[PDB]
Structure formats: C-alpha cells, structure tokens
Amino acid sequence: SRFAADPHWLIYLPPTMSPCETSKKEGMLEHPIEAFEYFRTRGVGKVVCGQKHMGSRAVVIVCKDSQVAEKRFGVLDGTAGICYTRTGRHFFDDMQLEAELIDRVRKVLDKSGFWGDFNTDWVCLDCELMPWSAKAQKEQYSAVGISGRVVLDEAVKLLKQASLNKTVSSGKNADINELLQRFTERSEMMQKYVEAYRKYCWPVNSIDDLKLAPFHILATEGKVHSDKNHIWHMDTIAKYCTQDDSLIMATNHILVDVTDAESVDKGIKWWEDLTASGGEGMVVKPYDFIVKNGRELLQPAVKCRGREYLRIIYGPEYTMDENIERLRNRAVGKKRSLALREFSLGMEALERFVRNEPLYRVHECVFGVLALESEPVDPRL
Amino acid sequence: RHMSRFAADPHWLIYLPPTMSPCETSKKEGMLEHPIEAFEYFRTRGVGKVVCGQKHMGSRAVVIVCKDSQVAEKRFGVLDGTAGICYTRTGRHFFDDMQLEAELIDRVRKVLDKSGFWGDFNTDWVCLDCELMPWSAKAQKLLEEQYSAVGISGRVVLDEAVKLLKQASLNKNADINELLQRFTERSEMMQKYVEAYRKYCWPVNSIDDLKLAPFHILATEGKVHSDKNHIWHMDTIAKYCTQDDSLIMATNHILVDVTDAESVDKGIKWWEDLTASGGEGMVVKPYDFIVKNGRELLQPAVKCRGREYLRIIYGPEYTMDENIERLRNRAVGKKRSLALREFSLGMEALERFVRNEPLYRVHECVFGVLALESEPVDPRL
Ligand SMILES: Nc1ncnc2c1ncn2[C@@H]1O[C@H](COP(=O)(O)OP(=O)(O)OP(=O)(O)O)[C@@H](O)[C@H]1O
Ligand SMILES: Nc1ncnc2c1ncn2[C@@H]1O[C@H](COP(=O)(O)OP(=O)(O)O)[C@@H](O)[C@H]1O
Numbered sequence: 227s228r229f230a231a232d233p234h235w236l237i238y239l240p241p242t243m244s245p246c247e248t249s250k251k252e253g254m255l256e257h258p259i260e261a262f263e264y265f266r267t268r269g270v271g272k273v274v275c276g277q278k279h280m281g282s283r284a285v286v287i288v289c290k291d292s293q294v295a296e297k298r299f300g301v302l303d304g305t306a307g308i309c310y311t312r313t314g315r316h317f318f319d320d321m322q323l324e325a326e327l328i329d330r331v332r333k334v335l336d337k338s339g340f341w342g343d344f345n346t347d348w349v350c351l352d353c354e355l356m357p358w359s360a361k362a363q364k365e366q367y368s369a370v371g372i373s374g375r376v377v378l379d380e381a382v383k384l385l386k387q388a389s390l391n392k393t394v395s396s397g398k399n400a401d402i403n404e405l406l407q408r409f410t411e412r413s414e415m416m417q418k419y420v421e422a423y424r425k426y427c428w429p430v431n432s433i434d435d436l437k438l439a440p441f442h443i444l445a446t447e448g449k450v451h452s453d454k455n456h457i458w459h460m461d462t463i464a465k466y467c468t469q470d471d472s473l474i475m476a477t478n479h480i481l482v483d484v485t486d487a488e489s490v491d492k493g494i495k496w497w498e499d500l501t502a503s504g505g506e507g508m509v510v511k512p513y514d515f516i517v518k519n520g521r522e523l524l525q526p527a528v529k530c531r532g533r534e535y536l537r538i539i540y541g542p543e544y545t546m547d548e549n550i551e552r553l554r555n556r557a558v559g560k561k562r563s564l565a566l567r568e569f570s571l572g573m574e575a576l577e578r579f580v581r582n583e584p585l586y587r588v589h590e591c592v593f594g595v596l597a598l599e600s601e602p603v604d605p606r607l
Numbered sequence: 608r609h610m611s612r613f614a615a616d617p618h619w620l621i622y623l624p625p626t627m628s629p630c631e632t633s634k635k636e637g638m639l640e641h642p643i644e645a646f647e648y649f650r651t652r653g654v655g656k657v658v659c660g661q662k663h664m665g666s667r668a669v670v671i672v673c674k675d676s677q678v679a680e681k682r683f684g685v686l687d688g689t690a691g692i693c694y695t696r697t698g699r700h701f702f703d704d705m706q707l708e709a710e711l712i713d714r715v716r717k718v719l720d721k722s723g724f725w726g727d728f729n730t731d732w733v734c735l736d737c738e739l740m741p742w743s744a745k746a747q748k749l750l751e752e753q754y755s756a757v758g759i760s761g762r763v764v765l766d767e768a769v770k771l772l773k774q775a776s777l778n779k780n781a782d783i784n785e786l787l788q789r790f791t792e793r794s795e796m797m798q799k800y801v802e803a804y805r806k807y808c809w810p811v812n813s814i815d816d817l818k819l820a821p822f823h824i825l826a827t828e829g830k831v832h833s834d835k836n837h838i839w840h841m842d843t844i845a846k847y848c849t850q851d852d853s854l855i856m857a858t859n860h861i862l863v864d865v866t867d868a869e870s871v872d873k874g875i876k877w878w879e880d881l882t883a884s885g886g887e888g889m890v891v892k893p894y895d896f897i898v899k900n901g902r903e904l905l906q907p908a909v910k911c912r913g914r915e916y917l918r919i920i921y922g923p924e925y926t927m928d929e930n931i932e933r934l935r936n937r938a939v940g941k942k943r944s945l946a947l948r949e950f951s952l953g954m955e956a957l958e959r960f961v962r963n964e965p966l967y968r969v970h971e972c973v974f975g976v977l978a979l980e981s982e983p984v985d986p987r988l
C-alpha cells in the first residue's frame with residue numbers, strides 16, 4: 227500500500243528476466259530455438275522449461291509461529307509470515323487474507339514434515355500468485371466526472387506555463403513532452419496487459435479463489451539452496467507443498483537436451499501447445515541454479531513468450547524492420563547484464579541473512595536490486 | 608486534427624472555438640494586465656462600446672442539443688443514437704461517462720422546451736458556446752467562490768506542477784520507504800499530479816457538481832448568428848436558458864463606453880473588486896459579434912486577467928522586477944494572428960454546416976483550428 231512491508235521481512239527481491247534474441251522466423255519475435263541456442267552455445271547441455279503461470283511475482287516467507295518471526299527476523303508484528311511483492315510491498319491490503327494464505331502453506335508444510343527434514347522453522351519461497359487481477363493496479367478512460375484526457379490536457383497546459391518560470395536554472399527544451407509520452411505509453415501498455423490477461427483472470431471472493439505456484443526454495447535456516455538444480459526445486463516443492471491443498475500448484479515443466487534435435491523438437495511442440503490460445507509462454511533455465519561459462523555468468527532464466535501474447539503486447543498491426551530488430555537485440559543486451567547484477571545482489575542478500583549478518587548489510591543488496599529496477603527499460607520485454 | 612481525441616461521433620464536430628489573446632501589457636507598476644489596455648485596443652479601432660464578462664474558473668464547452676435522437680441522425684447524420692454532445696476546445700468529449708453527458712444535454716433540452724426556444728427559432732437543434740464550471744453542491748455556490756472565501760487559489764495546483772518539474776529533473780542509513788519514494792516511476796509522478804489537478808479543479812461526481820454558462824447562440828437551423836451583437840446573445844440566452852433549471856447560469860457582465868472616462872472608471876473598478884475577491888479576471892468583447900475596421904478584423908475578444916491570478920500563470924515573483932519584460936508584446940502578436948485565423952475557420956465551419964455542405968468540408972475548417980492550436984506559442988498568453 228502506501229508503505230512497504232516491515233523491512234525486517236525483506237531479505238530478498240527477485241531479479242528481472244531477459245527475453246531471447248529476435249527470431250529470424252517470419253512473423254515471430256521470440257521462439258524457443260533462440261532460448262535453447264543461447265544455452266547450447268555456452269556449454270549447457272540440459273535446460274528446464276517451466277510453464278509461465280500468468281499471475282504476479284510473489285516472495286513468500288513462512289515461520290512455524292510468531293515467536294520464530296520475532297526472534298529470527300526481528301518482526302515485532304505478531305505475524306508468522308508474509309507474502310510480498312516485487313517492490314517490497316504486501317501483496318494484499320487485507321492482512322487477514324495474507325495470514326490465511328500463510329496458514330494454508332504452513333499446514334501443508336506441517337503434514338509433509340518439511341520443517342524436520344530441512345532442520346528449519348522458516349522458509350523463503352519464490353512464487354507466482356494467481357490470478358493476475360488479484361494484485362493492485364488501476365485508469366483514465368472511464369473517469370467518474372470530467373474525462374481523464376481532458377483533465378490531463380488541462381494539467382499539462384499548466385505544467386508548460388510553470389516551466390517558463392525562473393526557479394531552477396539547463397537550457398534544453400522542456401522534457402514535458404517526453405514526460406507526457408512515458409505517461410500515455412504507460413497507459414496504452416497497461417491497456418494491452420489487461421487484454422492479454424483478461425482471459426486468465428477471475429474475481430477473488432476468498433482465499434479459495436487464489437493459486438500459489440512456488441518455483442524456488444530460496445532459503446531455509448542456515449542454507450541458501452542456490453546449489454540445487456531446478457529439478458530438485460520443482461520436485462521438492464511438489465513433494466512438500468502440492469500434495470494436500472489445491473491452493474498450492476505444481477508447475478508443468480519439461481527437461482530439454484539442447485544438443486538433441488529430437489529433445490529440442492519436443493520442447494518446441496510443448497511451447498507451441500502452451501501458447502496456442504495466447505498463453506504467455508515459458509521460462510527456460512539452465513539445469514543448475516548457477517552456471518558459469520568460463521568466468522562469464524550465464525542467465526539464470528530466459529523467458530520465451532507466445533506469438534498470440536506478444537501480438538497483444540506489441541499490437542496486432544505491428545511490424546519489425548531492420549534497425550528496429552537491431553534496437554530490440556541491443557535492448558535485450560541491456561536487460562541481460564541488468565538481470566545478472568540483480569540476480570547476484572539477491573543471492574548475496576539471502577547469503578548475508580543466512581550467515582546472520584546485520585540487517586543493513588542484507589538491505590545493501592536487497593535495495594540494490596530495487597535501485598536497478600528503477601532504470602528505464604522496454605516494458606514489452 | 609485527430610479523432611482518437613474526440614472519441615465521439617464525428618458528425619457532431621461542426622465547430623471549435625478560437626484561442627483568445629490577452630491585452631497589451633499595462634504601463635502601470637506591478638501590473639502586467641489592466642483593463643485600460645483592453646479598452647484602448649477597441650477605442651483606437653472604432654469600437655465605441657464593449658461588453659465585459661466575468662471570467663470564471665472552468666473550461667470552454669461546445670454544447671449541441673437536438674430535440675431527439677431522430678433529428679440528430681437526420682440533420683447531423685449522427686449514427687450512435689445520441690441526441691446531443693458536450694465537447695472541449697480540443698474537440699474531446701467532456702465526460703468519459705456517456706450517461707453523465709446525456710443528463711447534461713437533457714437538462715438543457717428541458718430548459719429550451721419550457722421557454723419555447725425551438726418554436727421561436729424554428730429549429731430542432733442548436734449549437735451553443737459556453738463555459739462549464741465546477742459547482743459546490745453542498746454550499747450551493749461556485750467552487751471558485753468557496754475557495755476564494757478562505758484565501759485558497761490555484762497556487763495549490765501550481766505548487767504541485769512545480770514539485771513534478773523538480774522531481775522529474777532529478778536522478779541509520781537506508782530507509783525502504785524513502786527509497787520507494789525516490790525510485791517513484793516517472794509515469795507515477797505524472798499520475799499523482801493529474802489527480803491533484805482533478806481534485807482542485809474538477810471534483811465532480813455528478814451533474815449536481817457542475818454549472819453551464821452559455822454566452823453565444825452560434826447556430827440554429829438555417830442561420831449562424833454572427834450577425835447579432837453580444838447583448839442579443841446575452842438577452843436571448845437569459846430568456847430561453849436562464850429562467851428555470853439551475854444548471855444553466857447567467858454570466859455576470861457589464862457594459863463600457865470606451866470613449867467615456869466615467870464609464871471606464873466604473874469598469875476598471877468592476878474588474879478590481881472582481882479580481883480582488885480572487886476572480887480570474889474578465890473577457891472584453893466588442894459590442895458586435897464581428898467588427899472589421901478598415902478591412903482589418905478586430906479581435907473577437909480580449910482577456911484581462913487579475914494581478915493575483917497572474918502569479919499562478921507567470922510565477923509568484925513575476926511582479927517585482929521581471930515585470931519589465933513585458934517585452935512580450937510581440938508574443939501577444941503571434942497569439943493575435945492565430946486568434947483571428949481560428950475565429951474565421953470556426954464561423955466558416957458553421958456556415959458550411961448551415962448550408963448543408965458535406966461533412967468533410969465542415970471538418971476541413973474544424974481541423975484547421977486544431978492545426979493552428981498546434982503551432983508553438985507562449986502558453987501563458
Ligand atoms: N463570458 C465569456 N466570453 C468568452 N469567453 C469566456 C467568458 N467567460 C469565460 N470565458 C473563458 O476564457 C477562455 C480563454 O482564456 P483562458 O486562457 O483562461 O482559457 P484556457 O485555459 O485556454 O482554456 P478554456 O478555453 O478551456 O477556458 C474562453 O475559452 C472561455 O472558457
Ligand atoms: N516457472 C517459472 N520460473 C521463473 N519465473 C516465472 C515462472 N513462471 C512465471 N514467472 C514470472 O515471469 C516473470 C517475468 O515477467 P515480466 O512480466 O517479463 O517481468 P520483468 O521485465 O521484470 O522480467 C518473472 O518476474 C516471474 O514473476
């Protein structure tokens with residue numbers, strides 16, 4: 227809401243993800259071949275493909291009880307867990323709804339004997355939370371009184387007038403127009419998301435209406451599980467989390483040998499099936515959580531979105547020409563380096579927290595991710 | 608000259624009002640605009656008498672009313688089943704909410720019904736030039752007066768604009784909530800500003816929150832009324848729209864003998880008490896709708912804004928010694944050129960409509976106005 231969650235919970239923030247390079251196939255922006263190729267040509271023989279759920283990114287921390295939260299995290303709140311977003315805010319404004327979700331996850335972990343097997347009284351999870359409309363967003367095209375765009379036009383006029391006043395003085399034109407663009411583009415971009423996700427949204431009237439799909443066991447007491455491969459993650463999660471309660475989802479995923487023509491072809495067909503109706507697509511990850519070709523760090527994940535979906539996001543009547551394709555590949559380049567830095571910051575933050583370092587040291591890294599996500603990037607990516 | 612901005616049936620777009628020039632810079636001290644200059648402009652061009660209307664907080668509104676949806680389709684060629692429209696100088700719908708627009712048109716319609724306007728004009732439609740103004744339902748007075756009463760003005764909003772300009776031009780230890788503020792999306796900044804602008808200027812939830820002040824009966828079946836003086840427009844409007852429905856309000860106006868020292872003193876004082884109370888100022892018009900002095904067309908109107916109101920537009924510190932430039936007078940020159948050109952396009956649009964020229968011939972003039980409003984010019988004028 228107006229405020230972040232208690233900073234004591236914020237031990238981690240997920241990194242941005244890179245798309246694949248522009249496909250050479252006609253009418254295609256992205257295609258699995260580019261994703262698999264990136265890994266094949268960098269020494270990775272096996273990758274794991276996960277189905278994109280089409281919800282929102284959520285970090286979920288669960289403690290056995292309030293006593294654990296207070297002692298371990300210094301949370302003086304009375305809470306025994308949290309489900310927070312990407313900017314460190316609570317996913318829900320209803321703390322009761324959040325607590326129910328946490329309780330549901332706790333019960334599942336009780337029955338599966340997770341605590342005992344992991345020798346921990348808390349867990350941090352990287353998740354997707356569905357449905358997409360369950361989060362808060364919100365709109366100037368259906369105003370209550372005066373039309374949104376008229377009010378915008380008028381407010382913009384006064385902005386321009388105010389510019390001519392001498393307060394701060396440096397001689398370049400008013401970037402008010404560049405600024406009105408970032409605003410309308412944001413709006414037109416949001417309109418597109420609504421259209422792409424509308425089919426995958428349903429009202430939530432209770433916790434029963436939610437779906438949580440965890441894909442990472444980030445950390446438990448005394449260990450960050452960045453040393454475990456995604457198959458371990460997928461199945462451990464399925465074993466401890468998905469058996470008892472339909473609230474928690476397993477993630478449809480496949481293994482692909484990026485050197486095997488047959489395995490790759492099964493991967494492509496798998497992806498084609500996911501995105502046939504406009505599904506978002508898949509995330510392609512190296513078999514291992516962390517891989518290094520030479521000392522070059524490799525993308526921990528590459529997203530590969532469906533034709534129908536990208537059609538909506540980019541606009542149906544949208545064409546890519548040379549130079550634009552060239553610009554897209556450059557931008558993909560920026561996103562890559564950015565993803566790596568954020569990825570590492572988030573890993574170090576968890577590591578520092580696991581080693582019981584001062585909270586401000588953990589926040590050095592957690593906040594760094596936040597700062598990096600402030601930089602302007604192409605939203606369609 | 609766009610239609611995504613209009614959003615309405617293009618058949619309604621038979622007119623756009625012209626921009627308006629301010630008066631020559633006053634020679635008085637601490638004054639940028641004074642009624643003397645407005646009066647002088649008209650005196651030295653053969654206009655002996657002028658009409659002064661109070662300039663209210665609000666926006667120029669074009670309002671077209673047909674008796675019913677059938678007249679709309681037959682006379683205007685409208686296809687969406689509406690029977691009237693309220694739109695801005697920029698050709699945009701005033702409301703995102705069609706029912707709200709419909710209620711406003713219907714109110715005006717009923718008033719024309721009661722007065723027997725249709726019969727006395729032998730028309731089933733009318734095009735009105737108006738101002739739309741925020742109205743405090745609770746206090747039963749203009750929102751403007753309500754603010755005025757506690758020394759509140761548009762400085763509130765100017766301050767916001769100024770915050771935005773500085774915040775956009777930018778880049779115990781770390782506080783997460785300070786960081787979230789600091790990393791506020793540039794798109795979010797703009798959004799908060801527009802919302803603050805709506806809150807001050809247009810806190811409107813329904814028709815009870817608005818007034819309409821018509822000042823020109825532009826056109827009715829078979830006749831554009833540019834041949835009738837502004838006293839005729841004010842009288843006729845008072846007779847046919849001002850008697851009943853409280854939605855339609857009369858515009859406070861006086862009349863000045865520009866060659867008479869006593870009459871001028873009365874008008875100056877009228878303006879001073881008007882502006883001293885917080886008023887934006889006045890609009891000075893020639894007695895006739897169209898005056899041409901020796902093959903030269905006069906400004907159809909000149910605005911004269913109050914000293915305190917001009918601090919919002921020019922900056923609070925404009926008065927002290929920046930007042931000496933002021934050499935803007937040439938700036939007022941380009942503005943004056945656009946005014947005449949736009950004015951002529953608008954009367955031509957109406958004349959073509961009234962003589963049943965094809966829609967595109969009408970639109971050629973209307974879009975011409977938009978195109979001229981698109982030329983760079985000092986926004987404070
Ligand atoms: N009695 C009147 N006759 C003519 N114009 C009037 C009158 N009273 C108020 N006005 C307003 O003053 C306007 C132009 O001056 P100003 O620079 O303040 O307005 P603006 O901010 O361009 O936009 P708007 O035209 O939306 O009011 C006219 O468009 C009109 O709404
Ligand atoms: N199986 C999965 N593994 C990893 N990430 C996933 C998976 N399913 C969905 N995602 C989501 O895909 C997102 C990428 O979404 P996107 O809207 O492209 O954001 P960004 O530009 O910040 O990367 C991640 O933030 C994550 O929330």
